[model samples]
Each structure stands twice: as C-alpha cells, then as structure tokens.
Target: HKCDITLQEIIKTLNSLTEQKTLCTELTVTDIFAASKNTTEKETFCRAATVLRQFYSHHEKDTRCLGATAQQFHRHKQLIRFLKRLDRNLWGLAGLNSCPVKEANQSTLENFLERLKTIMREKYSKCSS
Candidate 1:
C-alpha cells in the first residue's frame, strides 16, 4: 500500500531526526500509552496524532530541526486524512497528550519515537498483502 510506504518513510525520517539530533534536538512528551490497560494500534495512533499536534506547537519556533520533521509530517498529511475518512473511530479520540519543550530530553524523544515506529512497523507487517 502506498499509505504504508508513506508511513515507513515518515518513520524512517523521524528515526534519522532523532539519531542525528540535528540542532541538538530535545523534547519531552507525556507517555500517552502509559497506564492504559489495553491499547489497540488504532488507539495508539490516535493518541500519537494528539502528541504530534502538541509537539508542533511546543517546538514550532525551533525551525532548523523541526522543519525537517515538519516536512515529513506534511508529506503524510494526506495519509492521515485518508485514514480519518476510513476510520472515524480513531479520529478526535481524547488523550492526555502534551510535549513539554526543552528538558533533559534526547532519549525521551527517542523513546517516544521508537514506540511510534515500532507500532507502525508492526502494523505494516500485519497489513502486508
């Protein structure tokens, strides 16, 4: 699926951004998946969308590194939109999502991103046709 490929690229780009730590990247976000009794992939992704939204506003001013991140997300905006059409259940779901900007952070952001990528990879594998 083209959407799956787009997701893969988004995941790859985010992995690179975190690894390179361009502009000395740093971030902190609420662990949305924490303490949940059970979570579906769709639910995790819904929560992820909320966190991604918060992250943008929290770090919007840090253009150097975030621009790269921003562009990657922009490329997938259509994919997100497409999903929203098919999966209304995942859209507008609530979560305790927040990204506290600039703290003792590289690995914090890395951890969040790793979780996201892992889920995406799992979904990709499961959905392969």
Candidate 2:
C-alpha cells in the first residue's frame, strides 16, 4: 500500500520509528532520520522537527510564549501544522538554512541545548516592563 500522508499517516510513520532507538537513545533525530529509507518516515521525521522548532522558537517577542498574546500562539500553531505538510523538505530551519547532517550530530544537540538554556535565561525570562 502507498502512503498519502494524512495526519494519521504521518503519526503512524512517527510511531513506528521514533521510539526504536536505532541511532540514539533519545531525541537525536538527525541520525535516525538520515538512516530512514521510506519516504513517509523521512517526512514524518521532518514534520516532528518542524513542530518542535516552532514551539521552541516562538515568533512572538516581549510576550508570553515569546509572542504578544495567545492569539500569536494560535497563529504560530497553525503555521506549524501546515508548513511541512506538503513540502516535507521544508522541515523547519534556523535562519532560513536547511539543517545539514554534519551540523546535527549528538554533539550539536548538546551544544544547542546549552545555548537554549542561555536563551531561556537571558532573553525569554527577562522582564520587558
């Protein structure tokens, strides 16, 4: 059977693979995704990355969830829902550049996590008023 990539189909792809730990024990997505053979599997991996990127890098500033209000959050959520639904290659990127495999290893994940702590501490938590 061929996959048409509905929400359920995407979730199905995610379920069968994300938990398998074939590469890393946890969320080291790049390795697992690079090893993927099926089209749906790769697309599902990209979708997961896209959604998480939107969540972490909220489009709003000087407000809760990095936005001005719940309204912004709603819109951001909508964007994530549709961004990679068609062009799975558009799997969310930082600064409009595609995520290269060489730059997405386990070491990269650790480095990014550390940087996020700083972003969370320095910017995301500062009082605007």
Candidate 3:
C-alpha cells in the first residue's frame, strides 16, 4: 500500500513532465515504472528522474526554438522539484515502515541534493547564453 501511493505519485509527476514536452508526448509514465524495478530502492527514483530530466533537457536544447527562452527551462526545475518531493515522501514512508535510519554519516540524500544543484547550474548556464 505504501508503494502504491509512491507509484501513483511517480506516475503523476511523470505525466506532468511528459506534458511539458511535445517530443515526449509519445512516452508514458508506465515506461519508467517498468524500467526501474531493478534499481536500488534508495536511488531508483533519483535515477528515473535524472533520466527523464536529461532526455527533456537534451530534446529542448537540440530544438533551439523549444529551448530559446529562460521560461522554457522550467522543465529542469520541475524535475528537481519532483525528485525532492519524492525523496521526502519516501523518507517519510520509510520512517512509517519502521525502517531504521542509517548512520548520520550516510550521504545519499545529501548527494542527491547536490546532484540536483549541479544539474540546475548546468541547465541554467545553457539558458543564459
């Protein structure tokens, strides 16, 4: 049931992202859900979001017209927001499930946040040019 809720949110975010790109109209959230099963639970959502973000980023950038304005860069923001929300939700779910929190030294969450910032910088740098 917990995973069901996560699955729904994942699908919703994927659908929203897909709607933002004409070239992505053919893609479905199910495609991602199907592909992500083998990934590590901690990084699965992050990897999926990264792949989707990169795809749309490349698609929009290559089109010139599609990515011409700063506004068009919102897709990257959306992706990062989705990833953050998913991370928070999953963390809460894990807490609810009574999963023990790993040692404070574990840095997966911090690494993910930094990755988002790095991607944002890279994405925006292109938009500013």
lDDT top scorer: 1
Report the lDDT tens digits of candidate 3 across residue range 24-76.
Answer: 33332223334433644445434444444444445433534333445556555
lDDT, candidates in the order shown: 0.53, 0.36, 0.43
Looking at model 1, residue 63 earns an lDDT score of 43
For residues 1-129, write the lDDT of model 2, one tens digit per residue. 232224334344334323331232233323323323443433433433553454334432223332234444546555344434423433421223333233234433333334333433453332231
Better of 2 and 3 by lDDT: 3
The model with the greater TM-score, 1 or 3, is: 1
Ranking by TM-score: 1, 3, 2
Model 3: colliding residue pairs: none
Q: What TM-score does each of the candidates earn?
A: 0.55, 0.22, 0.31
The lDDT ranking, best first, is: 1, 3, 2
Query: What lDDT does candidate 2 reach at residue 9?
Result: 47
Model 3 regions lying over 4 Å from their true place: 1-3, 24-76, 87-129
